[PDB]
C-alpha cells in the first residue's frame, strides 16, 4: 500500500471502561477550542447550554454565549440582523460557507470538529500526536509551498500550520500552559464534544454488568433446577424375556 506512522496509546484519564472524563481538563479544553481552534474550526453540534453542569455554571454559560453575536431574523421588514447569543445557540461557525473557508486557508478546508475523535482512526491519541508532532521533512522529501510537514498526517503534508505553542494562552485556573498540556486538554475536550454521553454511558455499563452477572447466575440455577429431573433420571430395559 503506502507508508504511514501510527500514533501511540496515551493513558487518557478516561480510557478505563469504568473511568469518566476529567471535567477540569475538559473545561480547559473548551477554552483552548474557544480561543484557538474556533478561529478556523466549526463545531456545529455543540451549544452553549451543553456546557452547563459539565464544565461551566449556567451563569458562566449565559455569559460565554453573549460574547458572540449571531444572525437572527427576518424582522418586520424582512431584513436579517445581529443579536447577542443565548445558551440555545450553537458554537459560531468561523466562515459563511466552505468555499470561503478554503479561500482563507489556501484551498484547504478545516473540518468541523464535532465528531473528529471518532472520524479518525486513533481519536485523541491521533489528534494529540498530530498536534505536538510537527517537524522537518526527512531527506528526499519535499513539502509543497503552503503545506507543513507532519509525519502523523497521511501524506505527511498537512494544510494546518502548527496551531499551538507554549503559553499561546493562559488557563485561568492556573495551569502551566505548555504545548503538550494544551493538546492534552483540548483532545480531552474533543472526546466530550464527540459524545457527551461518555460518563453516563459508562456508569450504565457498570450497572449492566452487576445486574447481568446477578441475573445470569440466578437463571443458571433455575435452568439447572428444572433440568435436574432429567439430568439424574435413570432408566432400564425390562422385557418379559
Amino acid at each position: 500500500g503506502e507508508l504511514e506512522l501510527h500514533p501511540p496509546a496515551f493513558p487518557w484519564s478516561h480510557g478505563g471502561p469504568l473511568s469518566a472524563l476529567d471535567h477540569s481538563s475538559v473545561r480547559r479544553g473548551f477554552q483552548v477550542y474557544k480561543q484557538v481552534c474556533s478561529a478556523c474550526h466549526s463545531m456545529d453540534y455543540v451549544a452553549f447550554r451543553n456546557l452547563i453542569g459539565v464544565t461551566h455554571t449556567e451563569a458562566e454559560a449565559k455569559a460565554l454565549a453573549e460574547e458572540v453575536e449571531v444572525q437572527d431574523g427576518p424582522d418586520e421588514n424582512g431584513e436579517l440582523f445581529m443579536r447577542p447569543g443565548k445558551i440555545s445557540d450553537y458554537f459560531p461557525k468561523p466562515y459563511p460557507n466552505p468555499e470561503a473557508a478554503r479561500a482563507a486557508n489556501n484551498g484547504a478546508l478545516p473540518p468541523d470538529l464535532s465528531y473528529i475523535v471518532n472520524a479518525r482512526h486513533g481519536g485523541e491519541d491521533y489528534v494529540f500526536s498530530l498536534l505536538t508532532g510537527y517537524c522537518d521533512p526527512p531527506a528526499g522529501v519535499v513539502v509543497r509551498e503552503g503545506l507543513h510537514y507532519n509525519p502523523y498526517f497521511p501524506g505527511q503534508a498537512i494544510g494546518m500550520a502548527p496551531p499551538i505553542y507554549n503559553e499561546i494562552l493562559e488557563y485561568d485556573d492556573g495551569t502551566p500552559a505548555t504545548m503538550s498540556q494544551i493538546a492534552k486538554d483540548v483532545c480531552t475536550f474533543l472526546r466530550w464534544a464527540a459524545e457527551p454521553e461518555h460518563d453516563q454511558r459508562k456508569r450504565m455499563g457498570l450497572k449492566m454488568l452487576l445486574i447481568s452477572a446477578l441475573l445470569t447466575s440466578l437463571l443458571y440455577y433455575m435452568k439447572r433446577h428444572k433440568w435436574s429431573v432429567l439430568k439424574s433420571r435413570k432408566m432400564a430395559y425390562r422385557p418379559p424375556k
Binding site: 441475573l215 440466578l218 437463571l219 433455575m222 435413570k234
Partner: protein, 49 residues
C-alpha cells in the same frame, strides 16, 4: 415380574437433608423449597428492576 423391580440409589444426587433414609423428609422441605424459590423470587426482582 414387577416385584423384582426397585428404584435405584439416588444418593449421588439427593440434597444433604434428604440423604438419610430414616429421617422424615418433610421437616427439611420448607427449607429446600424456600431456597429455590428464594433464588427465583430474586431473579424476578432483578428482571423487574
Amino acid at each position: 415380574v414387577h416385584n423384582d423391580v426397585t428404584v435405584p440409589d439416588f444418593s449421588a444426587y439427593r440434597r444433604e437433608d434428604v440423604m438419610d433414609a430414616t429421617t422424615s423428609s418433610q421437616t427439611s422441605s420448607e427449607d429446600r423449597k424456600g431456597f429455590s424459590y428464594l433464588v427465583t423470587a430474586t431473579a424476578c426482582v432483578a428482571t423487574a428492576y
